[PDB]
Design goal:
This is part of a larger assembly, with chains A and B.
Chain A: H1 20-29, H2 35-53, H3 57-68, E1 72-79, E2 82-89, H4 92-108, H5 115-128, H6 132-146
Antiparallel strand pairs in A: 1-2
Helix pairs in contact in A: 1-2, 2-3, 2-5, 3-5, 4-5, 4-6
Chain B: H1 6-9, E1 19-20, H2 27-42, E2 50-58, E3 61-68, H3 80-93, H4 111-123, H5 128-141, E4 147-154, E5 163-170, E6 179-190, E7 193-205
Parallel strand pairs in B: 1-2
Antiparallel strand pairs in B: 2-3, 4-5, 4-7, 6-7
The chains are: A mainly alpha, B alpha+beta.
The structure holds magnesium ion (53 copies).
Chain B binds four RNA strands through β4, β5, β6 and β7.
Organism (chain A): Mycolicibacterium smegmatis (strain ATCC 700084 / mc(2)155)
GO molecular function, one term (chain A): rRNA binding
Family (chain A): Belongs to the universal ribosomal protein uS7 family.
Chain lengths: 155, 208
RNA sequence: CGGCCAACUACGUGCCAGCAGCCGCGGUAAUACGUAGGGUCCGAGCGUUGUCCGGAAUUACUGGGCGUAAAGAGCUCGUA
RNA sequence: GGGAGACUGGAAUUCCUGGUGUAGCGGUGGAAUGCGCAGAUAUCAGGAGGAACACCGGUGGCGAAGGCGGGUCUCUGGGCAGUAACUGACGCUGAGGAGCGAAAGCGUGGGGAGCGAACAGGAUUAGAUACCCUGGUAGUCCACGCCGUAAACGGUGGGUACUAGGUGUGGGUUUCCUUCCUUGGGAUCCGUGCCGUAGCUAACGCAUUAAGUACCCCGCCUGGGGAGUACGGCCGCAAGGCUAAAACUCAAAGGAAUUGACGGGGGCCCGCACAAGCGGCGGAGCAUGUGGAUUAAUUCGAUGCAACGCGAAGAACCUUACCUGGGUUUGACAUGCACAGGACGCCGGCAGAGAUGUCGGUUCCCUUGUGGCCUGUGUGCAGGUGGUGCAUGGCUGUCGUCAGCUCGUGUCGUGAGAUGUUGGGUUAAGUCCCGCAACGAGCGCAACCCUUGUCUCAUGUUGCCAGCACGUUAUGGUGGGGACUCGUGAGAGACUGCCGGGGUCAACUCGGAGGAAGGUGGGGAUGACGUCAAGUCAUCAUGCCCCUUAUGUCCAGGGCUUCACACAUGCUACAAUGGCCGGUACAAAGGGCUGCGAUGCCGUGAGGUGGAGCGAAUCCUUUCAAAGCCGGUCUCAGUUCGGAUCGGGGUCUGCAACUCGACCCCGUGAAGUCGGAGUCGCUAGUAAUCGCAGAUCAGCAACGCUGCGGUGAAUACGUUCCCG
RNA sequence: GCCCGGAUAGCUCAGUCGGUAGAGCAGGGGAUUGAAAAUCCCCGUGUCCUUGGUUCGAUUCCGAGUCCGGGCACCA
RNA sequence: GCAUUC
């Protein structure tokens, strides 16, 4: 990437739900190349969501995504030896990447016995705006707004 | 260890094996015998000037072809040297051999022999620059030779600090696989140690 | 008897013992140290030290210099 | 803006007085001392006072130099041109001497706004008598003296004449073109710049404003340091200035220019360099190498990157180079010469740890010349994993698979050298294009070779099985079949070749079509000129040195496996994306002869027994995997996680598993709860994770190494920051 | 000699209530560096001078001893 | 911002 941006690998469409959001979620759950295991973790979590909320799982997943996606972010820059947290806008694709990474990582830190339970409950809380992933988003914006003065670097 | 041996680099393409046989079970024994033969031959006709030894085997037949600059010393007119060598050969090998003592067409195109000639001059305390230029000129006059490189390294002139000098004329495309590179190496024996002579002779391109 | 500067090799010690006018030679392979063989230059002399001139156009009359190498007074006026 | 004196103008800083008005101001890379909240900063009005004069204003003017810029007035110095009215060589230079002489400093008396040595705090730092911040005294200013130094520089003394031009600009004269516009143009005199000849110079450069060609006068130099110092003297209020040595010491100290290297210089580009991500290491246990310490010995080598699962692709004996002890000497192993043989050599017995010793049986061919052999006794000599990789060859690492490194003949320079190789563009690339005092060439780059991805043709066993027959209690099992695979031979295919837009109608570039593949398709092999006195005398070889009753050589036992610690590379874990039990699916590559070994039977199992069949596309390595998928169970617990350690009982290899092998079964059940500062790998079939095979090898310390397939991510805005 | 105050980690210093031994530097092991230093991260180090007494218990509360800082040793 | 030495 000294010679310029590299191409993004095409993501397939999930056969059960028909969202590419879902297969992106399984690629974040994916450990050690065990895709089939990650697949059923995600399917199970969406079924647990469907039974607990009654409504369509992909719709609630998208809602939870929209409540955890960061719009504004901080990038650190050394300037005169002092280090300044610089507010930078998040491009749409990065927003969803960040949101999904946050959802899965906090689900791994949750207390419920199995990952299907932890992931479904984190998705449900984030749909309501209650979860740890939502707090992370709010803290990301809090640090951006506290550093609004350093936006003039525009790096 | 910067330069791949030129012969081995081209061994499947532009040059050929110096021994032809097939054995599965006898392979180890065949190699042992070959080692013994080539050590018996490389330390016998030293002043005859040997370029190649090819060993062919089948059943018990052991055909040894010795390529030499001048076969005169490798066969006395009474057959004396052929008989002496065949005697020690069959003794060592265990079977029957047919020394096919040949001769080289263009001694001065032959990198192994050019290396021997430079080495012997250095053994006779000839200035190394002289021997280098002599070999270069002789080889380049001959019709196939499109380029030559000669390198001598060691205590050159009996100095205490090792020098490595090389002279080059023409093209010597060591990286080109299809290029026909003839390589020779010889170790000159001197009061102060050993000095190594390497010769690369480019003779054109082979397409097969 | 290294180069100036005519005349080279072996052995013995290996940064030691020593050499040297200058540059520099001795650190277990020295044409430079010590000895030997050989060689070179001189010869009833040959070397060394001291002293003066030369080379030294390096006090330059013959025969040198002063932008940056050493060298134009900080600048004027004016007496011999 | 030449100097001197007097008077005077406005902007701004500071302070003061008074409004308005609050709680911050001020300062830095970031802060803090500091000023405020008792009314600051800010804003408005008035007053005081000192210093410097924005714009004009320039590589412009004036002055001997130092120097000289608000305005006005007064007094006063110099310069230049025109006219030749006047004097008639009155000129030039000048040892000494005299005068002027930036800034700092000194004396006396004033003044003191701002600035600011010293001096305080604050910060930074290991320290910070500094740089940065807040304050702040002499001084900076005036009057009159003193001082007499500066890179007081054009580092270039003054006067005069001469020696191509071109082009700016300041001050005068004049001719023409004519509007008479006038920076119109010419000539001429006097300044001040730039560029360039000739000539000069070591070079850099100077070049009518000389560092050129010459004449007159002055000053000054004579290797670097000691030293512009001491002593003496003169001058000064002082500081100090001026004049000015020697002893002693060094073989140089210097000027200019050249090629490199380097920079906390610049420009332009790269690389998992960073950033964005994903998984690790540093914490625990164990394996392995190393340091250190032990030891009789713990053989030797490697020991920043580029030593440390490295030489070792295989240390119980052997290996083995080490230690202890026992033996042995032309030797464990060669070959030439003397001197005696007739045998050597086997196979057994006993003694010994074995080496070995001894005793019984066995035992030679041509032909008399010997021969092969040794009884053997000597003598040359063998033999050293003894030393020096800083005497070496060969082989290797490394920068770096980076794009660079050079030569021939011209040309430029006194020369080292330069040019080519720079410049503009472009590329992964010194790749190519366009220029171009260069024109070409060589080693590198690229390609040729291997492997992987597609198709065509040829061909059917041991491989394949579609279409036809015959068998299964099992399978291409079997008759057979070329049709699909596959194997291996030959060939086609990728060329920026084609189309559209960029472009020097150039390189090359961005996109599209077609195609299995697109832009060196992916990955191997391939390491230029050199560098590190890199590594290796222990693979081998080798100069020189050393040992020869040992530093050679045979053997038994021990060691290389030590252990209070430390480092490095790994493996297994800390669990539920998991552990355990049951069922079931899908590989590639490779290996096999005193070897791989199937069935069956016996063992819980390692394994035993026995041996079918295979030198193998045939047979064995199950019909070859694990992760995976389905089901059940455990339920967040130091546990049904973990599997270290230790007790008991076994198997196999081997003469032999005490030191010191692997594996199996029963029991045991340690640390470990995701690891401090810090640090490593990776850009797609990659990382992560899962098994399989091979070399070495009787057996294995293999978790190592080399290789094979299975499942398969995330992220890369970008070049500010770190490394190369 | 009299009157005070001392005496704690390798060094310089806190602590005291009768139930403690803590700071800075040094030292030791990591990390950073080509290598030192500086810096960063984990560690170790005490008859609390000696001495007896009180107390369930003494660095601590008493008396004594040794060593060391302070203020005094004067008038004829 | 800071960055001493061989
Ligand atoms: Mg001579
Ligand atoms: Mg003279
Ligand atoms: Mg003299
Ligand atoms: Mg001179
Ligand atoms: Mg002069
Ligand atoms: Mg000078
Ligand atoms: Mg002057
Ligand atoms: Mg005045
Ligand atoms: Mg006020
Ligand atoms: Mg105010
Ligand atoms: Mg004068
Ligand atoms: Mg004078
Ligand atoms: Mg002054
Ligand atoms: Mg004073
Ligand atoms: Mg004064
Ligand atoms: Mg005063
Ligand atoms: Mg200040
Ligand atoms: Mg004066
Ligand atoms: Mg002066
Ligand atoms: Mg000046
Ligand atoms: Mg001067
Ligand atoms: Mg002059
Ligand atoms: Mg002029
Ligand atoms: Mg000029
Ligand atoms: Mg000159
Ligand atoms: Mg001096
Ligand atoms: Mg003086
Ligand atoms: Mg004096
Ligand atoms: Mg990173
Ligand atoms: Mg570790
Ligand atoms: Mg760890
Ligand atoms: Mg070792
Ligand atoms: Mg390794
Ligand atoms: Mg052993
Ligand atoms: Mg070396
Ligand atoms: Mg070494
Ligand atoms: Mg060049
Ligand atoms: Mg170059
Ligand atoms: Mg060019
Ligand atoms: Mg090229
Ligand atoms: Mg290539
Ligand atoms: Mg070395
Ligand atoms: Mg040796
Ligand atoms: Mg042994
Ligand atoms: Mg070992
Ligand atoms: Mg378990
Ligand atoms: Mg525990
Ligand atoms: Mg737990
Ligand atoms: Mg890459
Ligand atoms: Mg094995
Ligand atoms: Mg793999
Ligand atoms: Mg008294
Ligand atoms: Mg020092």
């Amino acid at each position: 990437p000294r010679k310029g941006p590299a191409p993004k690998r095409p993501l397939v469409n999930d056969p059960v739900y028909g969202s590419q959001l879902v297969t992106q979620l399984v690629n974040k759950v994916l450990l050690e190349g065990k895709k089939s295991l990650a697949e059923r973790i995600v399917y199970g979590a969406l079924e647990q969501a469907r039974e607990k909320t009654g409504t369509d799982p992909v719709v609630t997943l998208k809602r939870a995504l929209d409540n955890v996606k960061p719009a504004l972010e901080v990038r650190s820059r050394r300037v005169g030896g002092a280090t300044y947290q610089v507010p930078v806008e998040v491009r749409p694709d990065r927003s969803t990447t960040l949101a999904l990474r946050w959802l899965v990582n906090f689900s791994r830190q949750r207390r419920e016995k199995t990952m299907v339970e932890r992931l479904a409950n984190e998705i449900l809380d984030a749909s309501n705006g209650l979860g740890a992933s939502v707090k992370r988003r709010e803290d990301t914006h809090k640090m951006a707004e506290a550093n609004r003065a350093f936006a003039h670097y525009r790096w | 260890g910067q330069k791949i041996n030129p012969h081995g680099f081209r061994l499947g393409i532009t040059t050929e094996w110096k021994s032809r046989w097939y054995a599965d079970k006898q392979y180890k024994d065949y190699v042992k015998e070959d080692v013994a033969i080539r050590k018996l031959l490389a330390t016998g006709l030293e002043r005859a000037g040997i370029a190649d030894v090819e060993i062919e085997r089948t059943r018990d037949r052991v055909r040894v072809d010795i390529h030499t600059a001048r076969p005169g010393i490798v066969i006395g007119r009474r057959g004396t040297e052929a008989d002496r060598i065949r005697a020690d050969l069959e003794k060592l090998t265990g079977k029957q051999v047919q020394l096919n003592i040949l001769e080289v067409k263009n001694p001065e195109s032959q990198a192994q022999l050019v290396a021997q000639g430079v080495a012997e001059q250095l053994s006779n305390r000839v200035a190394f620059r002289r021997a280098m230029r002599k070999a270069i000129q002789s080889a380049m006059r001959q019709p196939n030779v499109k380029g030559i490189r000669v390198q001598c390294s060691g205590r050159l002139g009996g100095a205490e600090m090792s020098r490595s000098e090389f002279y080059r004329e023409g093209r010597v495309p060591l990286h080109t696989l299809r290029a026909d590179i003839d390589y020779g190496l010889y170790e000159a024996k001197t009061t102060f140690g050993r000095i190594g002579v390497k010769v690369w002779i480019y003779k054109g391109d082979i397409v097969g």
